[PDB]
């Protein structure tokens, strides 16, 4: 589908509210495999299970290994911009 930009608002006591799979070392993108009900990704409205995360806050995740993506994603705070695509 089309590449989309999505805004998520996270408070500091919360995580993003997603599970991710994949990573460059596995030859698969960083994919959203779960969205937790009531947590920030669900509340933002614009993210879906099956979305590939292409970037977050301008940081490219297309070529990142699984744990690299975990570190980068967990570091983001507050108003967080995602670039995503559903294939």
């Amino acid at each position: 589908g089309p590449i989309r930009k999505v805004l998520l608002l996270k408070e500091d006591h919360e995580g993003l509210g997603i599970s991710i799979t994949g990573g460059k070392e596995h030859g698969v993108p960083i994919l959203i495999s779960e969205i937790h009900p009531g947590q920030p990704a669900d509340r933002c409205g614009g993210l879906h299970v099956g979305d590939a995360i292409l970037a977050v806050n301008g940081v490219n995740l297309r070529d990142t290994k699984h744990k690299e993506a975990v570190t980068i994603l967990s570091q983001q705070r507050g108003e967080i911009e995602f670039e995503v695509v559903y294939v």
């Binding site: 599970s19 991710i20 596995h26 975990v70």
Partner: peptide, 8 residues
């Protein structure tokens, strides 16, 4: 199963 999942 080959591919890991992390809750974040």
């Amino acid at each position: 199963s080959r591919v890991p999942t992390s809750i974040i």
